[PDB]
Amino acid sequence: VTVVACDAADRVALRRLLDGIPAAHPLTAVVHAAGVLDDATITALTAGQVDAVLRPKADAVVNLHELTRDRELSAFVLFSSAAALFGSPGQGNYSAANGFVDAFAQYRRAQGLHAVSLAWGLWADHLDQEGMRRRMARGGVLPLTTDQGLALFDAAQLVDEALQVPIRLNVGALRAAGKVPALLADLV
Amino acid sequence: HPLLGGAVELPDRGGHVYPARLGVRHHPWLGEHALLGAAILPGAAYAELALWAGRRDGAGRIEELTLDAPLVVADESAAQLRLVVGPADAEGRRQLTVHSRADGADADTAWTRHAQGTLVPADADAAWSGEPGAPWPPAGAEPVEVAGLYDRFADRGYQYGPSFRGVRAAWRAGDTVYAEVALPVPQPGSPRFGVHPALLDAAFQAMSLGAFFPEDGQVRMPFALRGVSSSGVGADRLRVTISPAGAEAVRIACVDERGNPVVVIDSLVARAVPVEALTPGTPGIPGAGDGALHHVAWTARPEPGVAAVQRWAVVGAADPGLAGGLDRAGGLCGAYPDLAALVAAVAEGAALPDVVAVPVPSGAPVGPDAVRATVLGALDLIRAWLAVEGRLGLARLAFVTTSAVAVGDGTEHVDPVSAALWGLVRSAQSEEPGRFVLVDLDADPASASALPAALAAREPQLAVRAGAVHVPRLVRHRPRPDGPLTPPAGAAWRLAAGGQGTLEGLALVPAPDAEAPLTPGQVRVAVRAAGVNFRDTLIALGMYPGTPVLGAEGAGVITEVAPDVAGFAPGDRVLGMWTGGLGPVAVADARMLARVPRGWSYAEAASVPAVFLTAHYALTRLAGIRPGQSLLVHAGAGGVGMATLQLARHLGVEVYATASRGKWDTLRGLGLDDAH
Amino acid sequence: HPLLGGAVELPDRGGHVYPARLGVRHHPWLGEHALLGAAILPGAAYAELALWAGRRDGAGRIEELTLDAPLVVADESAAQLRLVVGPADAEGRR
Numbered sequence: 033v034t035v036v037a038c039d040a041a042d043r044v045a046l047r048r049l050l051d052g053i054p055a056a057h058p059l060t061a062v063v064h065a066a067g068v069l070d071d072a073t074i075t076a077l078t079a080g081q082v083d084a085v086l087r088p089k090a091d092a093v094v095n096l097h098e099l100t101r102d103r104e105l106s107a108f109v110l111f112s113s114a115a116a117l118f119g120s121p122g123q124g125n126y127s128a129a130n131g132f133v134d135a136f137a138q139y140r141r142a143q144g145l146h147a148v149s150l151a152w153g154l155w156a157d158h159l160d161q162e163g164m165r166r167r168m169a170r171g172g173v174l175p176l177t178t179d180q181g182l183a184l185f186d187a188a189q190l191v192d193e194a195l196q197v198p199i200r201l202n203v204g205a206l207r208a209a210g211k212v213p214a215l216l217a218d219l220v
Numbered sequence: 221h222p223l224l225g226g227a228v229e230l231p232d233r234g235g236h237v238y239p240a241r242l243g244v245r246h247h248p249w250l251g252e253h254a255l256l257g258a259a260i261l262p263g264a265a266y267a268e269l270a271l272w273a274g275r276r277d278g279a280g281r282i283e284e285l286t287l288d289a290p291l292v293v294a295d296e297s298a299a300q301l302r303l304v305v306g307p308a309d310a311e312g313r314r315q316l317t318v319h320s321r322a323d324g325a326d327a328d329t330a331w332t333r334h335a336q337g338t339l340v341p342a343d344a345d346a347a348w349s350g351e352p353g354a355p356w357p358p359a360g361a362e363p364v365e366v367a368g369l370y371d372r373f374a375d376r377g378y379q380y381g382p383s384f385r386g387v388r389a390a391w392r393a394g395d396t397v398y399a400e401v402a403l404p405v406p407q408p409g410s411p412r413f414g415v416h417p418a419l420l421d422a423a424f425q426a427m428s429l430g431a432f433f434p435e436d437g438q439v440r441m442p443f444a445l446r447g448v449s450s451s452g453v454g455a456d457r458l459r460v461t462i463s464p465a466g467a468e469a470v471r472i473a474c475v476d477e478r479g480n481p482v483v484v485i486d487s488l489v490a491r492a493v494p495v496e497a498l499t500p501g502t503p504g505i506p507g508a509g510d511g512a513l514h515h516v517a518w519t520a521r522p523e524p525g526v527a528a529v530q531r532w533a534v535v536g537a538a539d540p541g542l543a544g545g546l547d548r549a550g551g552l553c554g555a556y557p558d559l560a561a562l563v564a565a566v567a568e569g570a571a572l573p574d575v576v577a578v579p580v581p582s583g584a585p586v587g588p589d590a591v592r593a594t595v596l597g598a599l600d601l602i603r604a605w606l607a608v609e610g611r612l613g614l615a616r617l618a619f620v621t622t623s624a625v626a627v628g629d630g631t632e633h634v635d636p637v638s639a640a641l642w643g644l645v646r647s648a649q650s651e652e653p654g655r656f657v658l659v660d661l662d663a664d665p666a667s668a669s670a671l672p673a674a675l676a677a678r679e680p681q682l683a684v685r686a687g688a689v690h691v692p693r694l695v696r697h698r699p700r701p702d703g704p705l706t707p708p709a710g711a712a713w714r715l716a717a718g719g720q721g722t723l724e725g726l727a728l729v730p731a732p733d734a735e736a737p738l739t740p741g742q743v744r745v746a747v748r749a750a751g752v753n754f755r756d757t758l759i760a761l762g763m764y765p766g767t768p769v770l771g772a773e774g775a776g777v778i779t780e781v782a783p784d785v786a787g788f789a790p791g792d793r794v795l796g797m798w799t800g801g802l803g804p805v806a807v808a809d810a811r812m813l814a815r816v817p818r819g820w821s822y823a824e825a826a827s828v829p830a831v832f833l834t835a836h837y838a839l840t841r842l843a844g845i846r847p848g849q850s851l852l853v854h855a856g857a858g859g860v861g862m863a864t865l866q867l868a869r870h871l872g873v874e875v876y877a878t879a880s881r882g883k884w885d886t887l888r889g890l891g892l893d894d895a896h
Numbered sequence: 897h898p899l900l901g902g903a904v905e906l907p908d909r910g911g912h913v914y915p916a917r918l919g920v921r922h923h924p925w926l927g928e929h930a931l932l933g934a935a936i937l938p939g940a941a942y943a944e945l946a947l948w949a950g951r952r953d954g955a956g957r958i959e960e961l962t963l964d965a966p967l968v969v970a971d972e973s974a975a976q977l978r979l980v981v982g983p984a985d986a987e988g989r990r
């Protein structure tokens with residue numbers, strides 16, 4: 033095991049990382065779990081606030097895609113959010129980054145490359161996040177235990193969908209209160 | 221007290237502290253009260269605690285009791301609860317707060333506050349007890365259908381376990397409701413409740429048995445209780461009277477079988493349950509027991525029975541072919557270069573459009589630089605649209621992208637850049653509902669013509685494929701005939717003929733003989749790809765139950781090696797010939813292997829063995845062909861045919877060959893004349 | 897602790913409560929400190945309690961400790977004493 037200081041969006045730091053991987057044990061797979069939150073309403077979100085959130089998600093994913101063409105990855109996994117699919121309010125830039133990631137897996141599967149985007153629900157185990165947990169609960173998302181979250185990672189490895197949504201939903205609580213989003217209408 | 225311990229003294233705030241440890245193993249009924257998938261403590265439980273601790277320290281009446289956020293009961297080792305009693309003020313009144321924190325949690329994690337209220341002295345001398353003889357049920361009360369009530373609560377979200385299901389009869393009488401409740405199981409232990417929180421909640425259940433609440437079909441819990449005096453002691457069966465106190469408040473008066481007033485609530489107010497206020501208890505899964513694997517499903521709409529129309533205003537880069545589709549239906553009111561021009565034209569008397577369309581252009585390079593541009597431009601535009609004054613703002617803002625999503629479960633290409641805008645608006649739709657729409661189009665000009673129909677569909681996001689509108693829906697993943705195969709639970713498995721004689725019968729089946737120990741001369745391969753011969757189709761067909769093994773060839777990475785084998789070691793990329801390679805694990809003979817050339821894909825590698833070995837074995841070892849000889853190759857555009865032509869050109873062979881006249885381009889490209 | 901019991905939890909003020917029962921029969925020395933005819937608890941006694949309970953809940957140093965009025969020790973069955981520990985503020989102080 034190695035731990036490396038590397039901003040995955042710094043195309044020179046990542047290239048300097050990959051070049052320093054042993055030749056007898058070449059890279060064969062990637063699990064992308066870099067992420068940054070910086071929340072603000074549409075009328076309030078700034079330019080740097082956008083750049084700051086896309087940088088780990090979109091800017092990094094693209095570098096991993098272009099710096100590894102000389103290697104055929106057996107797995108290439110992208111962590112997204114289910115707020116990209118549902119549209120969690122006050123998180124426009126976060127949704128844009130994670131929506132780019134979802135598509136960038138569909139964009140690799142089209143080319144014949146391994147890829148999967150996982151639009152995660154909410155995990156059981158922080159101020160920028162303590163604001164989001166509030167907004168994912170307001171929409172009926174419930175926390176996924178640590179083991180159960182991993183089990184979905186495992187089982188999703190067996191399914192040939194470029195985009196998959198491991199999530200736990202309190203569908204009854206939205207039907208009760210009448211706040212059912214259109215996307216969820218068939219789960220009642 | 222069955223739950224609380226001794227009162228712990230408090231000099232600073234002045235007063236007492238009643239501790240209590242909560243656990244389902246200690247009190248199995250603590251979980252048998254649950255709403256919408258969350259096992260929680262009923263509000264009725266906080267009342268028992270208050271009337272008991274309050275009678276002891278003078279303030280036996282509750283002036284007001286407020287509930288802030290419910291306390292969920294998880295699995296064994298539930299959380300401890302503490303009640304605080306305030307000091308006696310100038311009038312004898314004492315404050316109250318209730319708090320809970322997860323069992324064993326650290327001193328640095330804080331406590332959640334669940335209840336606060338105010339207690340007062342009250343004398344029971346005034347109206348101690350009633351008369352034992354008034355006709356109860358009152359004359360003219362309508363019997364209430366109690367049959368199967370517990371199934372009817374469940375359907376709405378009142379998930380009540382064996383301990384609270386005790387409403388056995390009831391009657392409605394105009395404003396008021398009369399009902400009898402009784403604990404399903406009496407409590408046999410000498411630490412007993414005066415009135416079980418289960419029996420009180422059963423009384424609370426009887427509110428939803430009348431018409432006290434709006435017909436909004438949503439679930440309601442106790443939120444605030446005012447003027448609660450309890451007099452008697454030891455009541456397991458009750459007779460409850462409920463009248464409306466005010467317009468939005470009800471008064472509850474329950475007696476024993478003999479008419480002795482046990483408790484009276486001067487006013488209870490219920491309030492709908494925030495969905496926010498839940499954490500999974502997993503009693504009886506009303507949704508998602510432990511979580512599930514979902515995927516979006518684009519499902520095509522039926523062709524609309526009639527032409528649909530809106531007023532349309534196209535603002536910006538008019539993709540060629542788009543305006544033609546909108547104008548067919550007669551909905552195109554104006555083309556404009558930007559929003560600023562539209563705003564002026566309409567103030568100058570142009571048509572107020574139902575829909576303002578914003579054509580997002582494809583072709584952006586898939587890189588960080590163009591994403592910021594696409595986002596920040598949409599961000600600036602949205603902010604411009606919300607500042608639009610007048611009736612023009614009421615129009616829907618339609619972002620019309622090109623292949624920004626994956627409609628079909630195939631290899632559908634996508635534009636990740638546009639899908640970044642798609643996500644920005646995705647959040648914007650929630651912040652400002654009804655303001656924006658997303659409609660994605662393929663490269664078919666026919667789809668531009670379905671765009672009116674798309675916007676005859678109040679869905680917020682939409683996609684059009686070949687002039688057919690699709691709407692997205694999240695869906696729990698499940699196996700499906702007529703769809704992709706699902707590999708078994710094992711790590712090792714392969715593709716195998718089902719024996720029914722059909723391609724539907726192909727199935728991914730466990731393959732233990734791959735995992736098995738190796739004999740000499742063998743290796744085990746973590747297969748990455750495998751080739752397919754036309755013979756492997758014929759095996760999939762044919763109705764004999766015993767069929768040959770599918771697969772002949774492949775490439776992958778070695779995992780184990782027999783001790784006699786040299787020249788291959790764990791970790792080496794290899795291609796070769798082996799049976800049953802249509803799965804992630806295969807055993808192979810080391811003789812029939814080769815190292816994968818630098819720079820090949822596993823697919824390129826796995827394609828080669830069958831075709832070139834057959835063509836090499838035949839040209840060189842069977843026919844012993846020499847330079848200058850002539851060769852005929854039937855089906856030269858096929859698999860083994862192409863391979864034969866490539867070797868034959870290297871061996872100095874004059875090649876003639878046949879193929880379908882449409883494949884002659886493939887032969888003339890392998891270096892053959894129209895005379896050949 | 898020879899005098900104090902277990903820390904009793906407090907959600908409202910936030911923090912802990914250390915109870916203790918005082919008695920000359922339990923601790924004969926509690927009376928052997930007296931000034932001008934009054935057997936009392938020395939200020940030195942309140943310091944021990946503070947450094948012990950304080951080390952356990954993070955704040956092992958006393959910035960300031962003020963004594964308002966002495967506690968007299970009468971004959972057998974002396975009075976109970978309670979110590980309260982505050983919640984940790986923005987700087988860790990209690």
Ligand SMILES: NC(=O)c1ccc[n+]([C@@H]2O[C@H](COP(=O)([O-])OP(=O)(O)OC[C@H]3O[C@@H](n4cnc5c(N)ncnc54)[C@H](OP(=O)(O)O)[C@@H]3O)[C@@H](O)[C@H]2O)c1
Nearest residue numbers: 752753754755772830834855856857858859860879880883
């Ligand atoms: N392990 C094995 O058993 C093994 C090993 C080596 C080879 N093979 C055989 O080699 C082939 C490999 O499969 P593949 O994917 O590469 O397919 P393919 O052979 O490349 O394509 C089929 C060819 O067969 C011709 N053909 C034969 N009968 C025909 C008919 N009635 N009508 C039209 N065309 C006919 C076609 O002529 P046109 O050119 O005019 O289209 C076409 O070129 C299989 O047939 C396989 O049985 C099997």
